[PDB]
Amino acid sequence: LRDNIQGITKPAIRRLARRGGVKRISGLIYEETRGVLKVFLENVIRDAVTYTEHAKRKTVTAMDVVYALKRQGRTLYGFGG
Template identity: 75%
Template structure:
């Protein structure tokens, strides 16, 4: 036998043994902030307005019982309202040759739609 051929068993490469610690996920130890968390990818941002959030708004408005189809209808109306508001606020921003939408732009857009909001300056 030559010196390059030794009689040692072949070494197998194994995956590292997972630690049994509290933060053993893909995020590593995570430092002070904790491990990284990746939520579900939302297909549409309007789905972020969840059923319980809509239910809380309804309770605040005095509604007791809510139909199952009401949630989708509410999301549609909310999306339309926010789209119109953003377009109006953006028009005010572009007219004043700015790239940042200010609070006053949103307030003027709300006033234009007939929903005056007080308490935010101006």
């Protein structure tokens, strides 16, 4: 549907920042990080869906996602390859 970017809640963004090493976080960081995550996900999902449609399938596969990430310079170990 719509309005699911808010599912990446403020506490989740704070946990990710604390994993990064951030000590204090400004209030607009949450919206900026949501926009950034949205852009990254659109890029990866577009590549993965192109890979899926090339196979005449209707299921986005972990292999499709792995190839989409690999063709962006971000190799992912663990889900095959």
